[PDB]
């Protein structure tokens, strides 16, 4: 924990809110020009944890809520998530009367304490029903996007997440009216009949310096799973798939050349860095264990 | 509404007609094609067909299968289903009767009585178990012979007889004039068992014949009452008790040489489940977006405990697809569409 910096780190400016910049970016409205504008959604660790806990706590029923944050450039930042007092069946949720009063009161109370962020989106949980936009979510997301432009639909699946051990969070945004534009068919199948109406987004997560510092001492028995990590063995299929997509991207960039090369180089660097990190861990293990009593 | 077409298809002597009968049948179907609630019409027509074919004979099987074929159009092969089965059963009964007549004429040709069987199928017809009444020894020989013949022809079928939906003729010998009776099985049995002896009390009839009390009461209600001359009794209307001393009068002056006292035919006496099924249909969807019909039905059957009939499945699927909850290009597949 020493021989480094302990003050405001380079992962804390993401948590800083600038009112003037947000006002300028809201007045600019760069989203209306290119409709494929937003492509990245950065969610805080706290927001994701709260969303997953609330979705799982609902049991087999469906739950819904809001999420705060802001928007910068080509990315949407989602910082906090607060639930709603909704009473939904196994398929549909309504949020009839007490949900909106809760929204207004909670936003006002949060602004009282110091929460300077505004509402940035809504989320609703599919209890084992995959991760896609239904014919009602599409309509309500279009309704929200028509007037409150900075918005995003987050879909979470609690049952599948708890059964498979991996979170299933999907960020989506709807195209406006009249916007038309051995390989698996899941690309069309896993979406509803409105597959051409909405498009997904790249979901990433971030955490603060204090978040990582406190989570470093979260538990002191994963060291065994790190020493006997067995890297380059549990994700070989991942690396082969990455190599295949990298070859496809290289072919596309070569066709274009005859700026697309930048993302291909980035993907290649990422895959190679992962492989080199795995080899480094294996070399460290070999030096630690097998180089003793020779 | 089907009563009109049943009466038009019924045998009526002078009612017999020509190709314009087929035209009127087509007109009836023209009035029917836009009528909703086809299930009630189909059930009523099934009952009418069973009544016309099971007991007695209709005007002609010609217009019968013509009507069946006409209902096959615009409805579907699987929708008609049973009626074609009844028609095939009647054809098989005729063929089997011809074969049995040939067999009886071939070996040990005696022919004490003239049997006429109408073997039906268990499933299609609206069957009903008989009273298990003991048959008098005159007709037991033919029952045994036909049972043996049927077992020899078809292997492993078993005959489930029904002694409540048949007719017979009795050669009465009270006095001069062989008044040929036409009776049901119960009346045949009563008269035959009364033949040996005289003046059997009602309890004696119950013991000797074995008919149920209610059916025996209904049967003995006839053979009297009408015209007050079949049997002379001091009580009128209905008066029968245990130990009653009744005997047929030793004369029958009914003024016609055709006796039909088988007049019995004339003097014959969900919301919660639908909600659960709809909820199951919705829950199966919003998951498997594109699903086949049979797969959907099997999935709902798996997800439910109580049996539920497939008709409920079909009607609820149609009702909930009417509400734009799904959409239907294969005709046996559904997309979610919300």
Curated annotation (Swiss-Prot), chain A:
**InterPro entries named among the record's database cross-references:** CSN5_C (IPR040961), JAMM/MPN+_dom (IPR000555), JAMM_MPN+_peptidase_M67A (IPR050242), MPN (IPR037518)
- Offer one example of a GO biological process linked to this entry: translation
Which key words are in the record?
A: Acetylation, Cytoplasm, Cytoplasmic vesicle, Hydrolase, Metal-binding, Metalloprotease, Nucleus, Protease, Signalosome, Synapse, Zinc
Q: Which domain of life is it from?
A: Eukaryota
- Kindly give any further remark recorded in the entry: The CSN complex is associated with some 'Lys-63'-specific deubiquitination. Such activity is however not mediated by the core CSN complex but by the BRCC3/BRCC36 component of the BRISC complex.
**Partners and quaternary state?**
Component of the CSN complex, composed of COPS1/GPS1, COPS2, COPS3, COPS4, COPS5, COPS6, COPS7 (COPS7A or COPS7B), COPS8 and COPS9 isoform 1. In the complex, it probably interacts directly with COPS1, COPS2, COPS4, COPS6 and COPS7 (COPS7A or COPS7B) and COPS9 isoform 1. Interacts with COPS9 isoform 2. The CSN complex interacts with the BRISC complex. Also exists as monomeric form. Interacts with TP53, MIF, JUN, UCHL1, NCOA1, HIF1A, CDKN1B, BCL3, GFER, PGR, LHCGR, SMAD4, SMAD7, ID1, ID3, ITGB2 and TOP2A. Part of a complex consisting of RANBP9, Ran, DYRK1B and COPS5. Interacts with IFIT3.
Q: Name one GO molecular function term.
A: macrophage migration inhibitory factor binding
Q: What does the comment on domains in this protein's record state?
A: The JAMM motif is essential for the protease activity of the CSN complex resulting in deneddylation of cullins. It constitutes the catalytic center of the complex.
Q: Which species is listed as the source?
A: Homo sapiens (Human)
As for what it does, the entry says: Probable protease subunit of the COP9 signalosome complex (CSN), a complex involved in various cellular and developmental processes. The CSN complex is an essential regulator of the ubiquitin (Ubl) conjugation pathway by mediating the deneddylation of the cullin subunits of the SCF-type E3 ligase complexes, leading to decrease the Ubl ligase activity of SCF-type complexes such as SCF, CSA or DDB2. The complex is also involved in phosphorylation of p53/TP53, c-jun/JUN, IkappaBalpha/NFKBIA, ITPK1 and IRF8, possibly via its association with CK2 and PKD kinases.
Q: Where does Zn(2+) bind?
A: 124, 126, 137
Cofactor(s) named in the record: a divalent metal cation
Q: What is its EC number?
A: 3.4.-.-
Its principal location?
cytoplasm
Whichever gene encodes this chain, its name is: COPS5
| Classification via PANTHER family | EUKARYOTIC TRANSLATION INITIATION FACTOR 3 -RELATED
GO cellular component terms, semicolon-separated? chromatin; COP9 signalosome; cytoplasm; cytosol; eukaryotic translation initiation factor 3 complex; nucleoplasm; nucleus; perinuclear region of cytoplasm
Motif interval(s): JAMM motif:
124-137
What is this protein's record name?
A: COP9 signalosome complex subunit 5
UniProtKB/Swiss-Prot annotation, chain B:
Species name? Homo sapiens
| Top-level taxon | Eukaryota
Q: Which family does it belong to?
A: Belongs to the cullin family.
* Record cross-link Glycyl lysine isopeptide (Lys-Gly) (interchain with G-Cter in NEDD8), residues: 286
Stated role: Core component of multiple cullin-RING-based E3 ubiquitin-protein ligase complexes which mediate the ubiquitination of target proteins. As a scaffold protein may contribute to catalysis through positioning of the substrate and the ubiquitin-conjugating enzyme. The E3 ubiquitin-protein ligase activity of the complex is dependent on the neddylation of the cullin subunit and is inhibited by the association of the deneddylated cullin subunit with TIP120A/CAND1. The functional specificity of the E3 ubiquitin-protein ligase complex depends on the variable substrate recognition component.
Q: How does it assemble?
A: Can self-associate. Component of multiple DCX (DDB1-CUL4-X-box) E3 ubiquitin-protein ligase complexes that seem to consist of DDB1, CUL4A or CUL4B, RBX1 and a variable substrate recognition component which seems to belong to a protein family described as DCAF (Ddb1- and Cul4-associated factor) or CDW (CUL4-DDB1-associated WD40-repeat) proteins.
PTM description: Neddylated; required for activity of cullin-RING-based E3 ubiquitin-protein ligase complexes. Deneddylated via its interaction with the COP9 signalosome (CSN) complex. (Microbial infection) Deneddylated by Epstein-Barr virus BPLF1 leading to a S-phase-like environment that is required for efficient replication of the viral genome.
This protein's name = Cullin-4A
- Where would I find the Cullin neddylation domain in this sequence? 272-330
């Amino acid at each position: 924990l020493a021989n480094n910096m302990q003050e405001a780190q380079s992962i804390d400016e993401i948590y800083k809110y600038d009112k003037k910049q947000q006002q300028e970016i809201l007045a600019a409205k760069p989203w209306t020009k290119d409709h494929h504008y937003f492509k990245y959604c950065k969610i805080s660790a706290l927001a994701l944890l709260k969303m997953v806990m609330h979705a799982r706590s609902g049991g087999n029923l469906a739950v819904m809520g809001l999420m705060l944050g802001k928007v910068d450039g080509e990315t949407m930042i989602i910082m906090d998530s607060f639930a709603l007092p909704v009473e939904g069946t196994e398929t549909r949720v309504n949020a009839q009367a007490a949900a909106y009063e809760y929204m207004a009161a909670y936003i006002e109370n949060a602004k009282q304490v110091g929460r300077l962020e505004n509402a940035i989106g809504w989320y609703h949980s599919h209890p084992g029903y995959g991760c896609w936009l239904s014919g009602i979510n599409v309509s309500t997301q279009m309704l929200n996007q028509q007037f409150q432009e900075p918005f995003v639909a987050v879909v979470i699946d609690p049952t599948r997440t708890i059964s498979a051990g991996k979170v299933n969070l999907g960020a989506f945004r709807t195209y406006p009216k009249g916007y038309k534009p051995t390989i698996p068919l899941n690309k069309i199948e896993d979406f509803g009949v409105h597959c051409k109406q909405y498009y997904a987004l790249e979901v990433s997560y971030f955490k603060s310096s204090l978040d990582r510092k406190l989570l470093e001492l979260l538990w002191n028995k994963y060291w065994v799973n790190t020493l006997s990590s067995s890297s380059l063995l549990t994700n070989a299929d991942y690396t082969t798939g990455q190599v295949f997509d990298l070859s496809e991207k290289l072919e596309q960039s070569e066709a274009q050349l005859g700026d697309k090369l930048a993302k291909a180089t980035r993907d290649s660097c990422k895959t190679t860095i992962e492989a080199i990190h795995g080899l480094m861990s294996q070399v460290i293990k070999d030096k630690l264990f097998n180089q003793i009593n020779i | 509404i089907a009563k009109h077409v049943d009466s038009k298809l019924r045998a009526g002597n002078k009612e017999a007609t020509d190709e314009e009968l087929e035209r009127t049948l087509d007109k009836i179907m023209i009035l029917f094609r836009f009528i909703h609630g086809k299930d009630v019409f189909e059930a009523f027509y099934k009952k009418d067909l069973a009544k016309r074919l099971l007991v007695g004979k209709s005007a002609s099987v010609d217009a019968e299968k013509s009507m069946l074929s006409k209902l096959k159009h615009e409805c579907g092969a699987a929708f008609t289903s049973k009626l074609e089965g009844m028609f095939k059963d009647m054809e098989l009964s005729k063929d089997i009767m011809v074969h049995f007549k040939q067999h009886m004429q071939n070996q040990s040709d005696s022919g004490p009585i003239d049997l006429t069987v109408n073997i039906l199928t268990m499933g299609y017809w609206p069957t009903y178990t008989p009273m298990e009444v003991h048959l008098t020894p005159e007709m037991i020989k033919l029952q045994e012979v036909f049972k043996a013949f049927y077992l020899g022809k078809h292997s492993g079928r078993k005959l489930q007889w029904q002694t409540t939906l048949g007719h017979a003729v009795l050669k009465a010998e009270f006095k001069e004039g062989k008044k040929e009776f036409q009776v049901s099985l119960f009346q045949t049995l009563v008269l035959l068992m009364f033949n040996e002896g005289d003046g059997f009390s009602f309890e004696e009839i119950k013991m000797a014949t074995g008919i149920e009390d209610s059916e025996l009461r209904r049967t003995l209600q006839s053979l009297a009452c009408g015209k007050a001359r079949v049997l002379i009794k001091s009580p009128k209307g209905k008066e029968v008790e245990d130990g009653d001393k009744f005997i047929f009068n030793g004369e029958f002056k009914h003024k016609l040489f055709r006796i039909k006292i088988n007049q019995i035919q004339m003097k014959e006496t969900f919301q919660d489940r639908q909600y659960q099924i709809d909820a199951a249909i919705v829950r199966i969807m919003k998951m498997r977006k594109t699903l086949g019909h049979n797969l959907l039905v099997s999935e709902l059957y798996n997800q439910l405990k109580f049996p539920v009939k497939p008709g409920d499945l079909k009607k609820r699927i149609e009702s909930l697809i009417d509400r734009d909850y799904m959409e239907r290009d294969n005709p046996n597949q559904y997309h979610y569409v919300a």
